[PDB]
Amino acid sequence: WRAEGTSAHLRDIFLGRCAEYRALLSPEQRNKDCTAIWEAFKVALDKDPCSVLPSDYDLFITLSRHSIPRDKSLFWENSHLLVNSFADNTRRFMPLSDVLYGRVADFLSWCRQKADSGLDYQSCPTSEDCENNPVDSFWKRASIQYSKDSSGVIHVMLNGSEPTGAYPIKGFFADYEIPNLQKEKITRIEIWVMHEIGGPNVESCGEGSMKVLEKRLKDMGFQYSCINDYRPVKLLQCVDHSTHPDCALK
Amino acid sequence: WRAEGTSAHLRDIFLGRCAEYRALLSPEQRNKDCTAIWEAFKVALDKDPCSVLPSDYDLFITLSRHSIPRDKSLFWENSHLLVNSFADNTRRFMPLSDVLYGRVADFLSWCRQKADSGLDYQSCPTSEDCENNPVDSFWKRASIQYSKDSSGVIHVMLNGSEPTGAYPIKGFFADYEIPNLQKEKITRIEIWVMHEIGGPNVESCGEGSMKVLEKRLKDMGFQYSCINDYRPVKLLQCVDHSTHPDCALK
Ligand SMILES: Nc1ncnc2c1ncn2[C@@H]1O[C@H](COP(=O)(O)OP(=O)(O)OP(O)(O)=S)[C@@H](O)[C@H]1O
Ligand SMILES: Nc1ncnc2c1ncn2[C@@H]1O[C@H](COP(=O)(O)OP(=O)(O)OP(O)(O)=S)[C@@H](O)[C@H]1O
Ligand SMILES: *[C@@H]1O[C@H](CO)[C@@H](O[C@@H]2O[C@H](CO)[C@@H](O)[C@H](O)[C@H]2NC(C)=O)[C@H](O)[C@H]1NC(C)=O
Numbered sequence: 001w002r003a004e005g006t007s008a009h010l011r012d013i014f015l016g017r018c019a020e021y022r023a024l025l026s027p028e029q030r031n032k033d034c035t036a037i038w039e040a041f042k043v044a045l046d047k048d049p050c051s052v053l054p055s056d057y058d059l060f061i062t063l064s065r066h067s068i069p070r071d072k073s074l075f076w077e078n079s080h081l082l083v084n085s086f087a088d089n090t091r092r093f094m095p096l097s098d099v100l101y102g103r104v105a106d107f108l109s110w111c112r113q114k115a116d117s118g119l120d121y122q123s124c125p126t127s128e129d130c131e132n133n134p135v136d137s138f139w140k141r142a143s144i145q146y147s148k149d150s151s152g153v154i155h156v157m158l159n160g161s162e163p164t165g166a167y168p169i170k171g172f173f174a175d176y177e178i179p180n181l182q183k184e185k186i187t188r189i190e191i192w193v194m195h196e197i198g199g200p201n202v203e204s205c206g207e208g209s210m211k212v213l214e215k216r217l218k219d220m221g222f223q224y225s226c227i228n229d230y231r232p233v234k235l236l237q238c239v240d241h242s243t244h245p246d247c248a249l250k
Numbered sequence: 251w252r253a254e255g256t257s258a259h260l261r262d263i264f265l266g267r268c269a270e271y272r273a274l275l276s277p278e279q280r281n282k283d284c285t286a287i288w289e290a291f292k293v294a295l296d297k298d299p300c301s302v303l304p305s306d307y308d309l310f311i312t313l314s315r316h317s318i319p320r321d322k323s324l325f326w327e328n329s330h331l332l333v334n335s336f337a338d339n340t341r342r343f344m345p346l347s348d349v350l351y352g353r354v355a356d357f358l359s360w361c362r363q364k365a366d367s368g369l370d371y372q373s374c375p376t377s378e379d380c381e382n383n384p385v386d387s388f389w390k391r392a393s394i395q396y397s398k399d400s401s402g403v404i405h406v407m408l409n410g411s412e413p414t415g416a417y418p419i420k421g422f423f424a425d426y427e428i429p430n431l432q433k434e435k436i437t438r439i440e441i442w443v444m445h446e447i448g449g450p451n452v453e454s455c456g457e458g459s460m461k462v463l464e465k466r467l468k469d470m471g472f473q474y475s476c477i478n479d480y481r482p483v484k485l486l487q488c489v490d491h492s493t494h495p496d497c498a499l500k
């Protein structure tokens with residue numbers, strides 16, 4: 001397998017994240033069974049590492065699903081760490097990694113061994129090895145739910161320093177989230193194209209892949225907007241480059 | 251008991267945090283038994299809620315102690331959340347909450363029932379209810395170790411918008427950390443007096459309690475320096491006040 005093996009102490013990490021997250025929930029939605037949720041998630045670790053389908057996690061989602069505040073969704077591509085830091089544990093926004101079912105598996109890996117009941121800690125199948133692997137199917141399933149339950153002002157953070165452009169036509173956002181957005185409960189979509197401090201400006205709003213994205217969104221009939229280096233986020237990137245001119249304050 | 255009761259699912263949270271932290275540990279000091287560590291922690295947990303002494307956590311400390319990178323220590327007062335954010339999980343600096351034994355208890359609460367073998371999820375004793383309570387003796391023991399194991403350039407983040415002054419002459423830093431710093435392995439102490447954006451400038455370097463802190467450190471023989479609103483941290487504060495004039499860029 002050409003990808004990371006399952007995360008060590010997966011169960012403990014999972015249950016822990018689940019426990020801590022419950023605190024961030026509203027008492028009316030606070031009653032979540034972390035053991036049951038782990039139990040349903042665990043089903044994929046009992047199948048062939050190349051035979052797990054998104055729907056296999058339907059029960060898992062059912063047990064952990066909860067509502068997302070209006071205007072709090074934050075989608076993204078190529079900006080994982082910045083999104084988590086900016087989202088600041090649901091304080092500012094609530095990206096998929098700050099929603100119960102996304103929180104418990106964020107950055108982790110998992111998969112059973114090819115011909116054995118045990119978990120493979122050596123490596124796990126990538127999309128190339130086989131399409132229906134545990135981790136991908138998990139995220140496809142989780143992305144869909146996240147898209148379906150999102151409402152109001154939709155935010156999206158893209159990387160304008162990514163060599164392949166800010167918008168991947170075959171990414172999770174393009175294949176599993178844009179299609180699952182309930183247009184009826186979405187007021188508008190606002191893109192933030194971020195660039196590395198002094199970093200390369202491969203694409204900015206309205207250029208290259210961003211034209212492809214914008215077209216699709218408008219075609220689908222969405223009020224749309226785009227901001228290069230959205231300030232709050234730029235300020236956060238700047239924390240690590242205080243002396244750089246782009247970060248100098250008045 | 252006037253303090254918060256013990257955190258729900260204390261064990262699951264503790265084990266999860268411990269498990270996750272292991273990854274952030276150097277391959278040499280990655281050998282940590284979380285269950286063991288939890289069991290040692292539980293030794294102080296099962297005593298009378300007002301009969302727990304810092305010494306009661308010696309085993310726990312022994313089993314979870316690990317080195318702190320030279321020049322990466324970050325002490326503080328009245329700026330817990332900001333410190334946790336800036337440190338950004340051992341990436342920039344390594345505050346006590348980013349060291350194994352601090353990370354497992356950060357923000358949590360705990361104590362056994364006045365008269366029963368079960369944990370009291372109703373309330374826990376505060377400093378006034380009684381001195382030797384589980385939580386306070388914990389941070390006393392942890393603070394002492396963190397200080398004992400710090401070296402290089404010592405950093406300290408204080409809140410200059412604190413009504414009562416930046417330096418609490420009776421806080422943990424003054425009573426349990428400053429006394430345990432090892433001068434022979436410390437180069438200098440640098441303080442960052444942070445003020446709320448727009449917020450009040452109750453005290454700045456060289457004013458009020460800051461004069462006391464400076465004088466104490468100097469009488470002890472330390473090289474000392476103080477900075478008002480250390481830029482990197484200021485920028486982080488600015489993330490939430492992007493439009494405020496103190497946060498405008500060039
Ligand atoms: N919101 C999300 N949170 C976490 N992982 C996600 C999310 N959406 C999709 N994923 C999947 O995360 C898996 C991990 O693969 P990597 O791309 O190596 O890691 P990463 O740190 O998530 O990098 P990114 O998403 O490309 S910036 C992929 O299968 C992603 O498609
Ligand atoms: N490095 C540390 N990490 C976490 N808690 C600490 C640390 N040093 C001391 N404590 C204790 O944290 C406990 C929690 O009390 P609070 O002061 O209400 O919370 P807090 O979030 O720590 O707020 P602060 O310290 O005033 S900004 C107190 O018993 C503190 O003395
Ligand atoms: C935005 O994309 C850039 C380019 O891929 C990321 O920066 C690269 O990060 C990798 C891994 O850390 C490095 O090997 C490259 O050298 C980096 N290139 C540059 C120009 O910095 C950047 O990390 C991405 N931003 C976010 C938030 O994920």
Ligand SMILES: *[C@@H]1O[C@H](CO)[C@@H](O[C@@H]2O[C@H](CO)[C@@H](O)[C@H](O)[C@H]2NC(C)=O)[C@H](O)[C@H]1NC(C)=O
Nearest residue numbers: 328329330331332409410411412413446449450
């Ligand atoms: C620095 O100290 C100030 C003042 O004690 C803290 O701000 C207070 O925070 C409470 C709770 O959030 C509010 O109810 C008060 O209105 C705030 N006072 C002021 C003047 O803003 C502030 O949180 C501290 N900073 C940090 C990083 O902990």
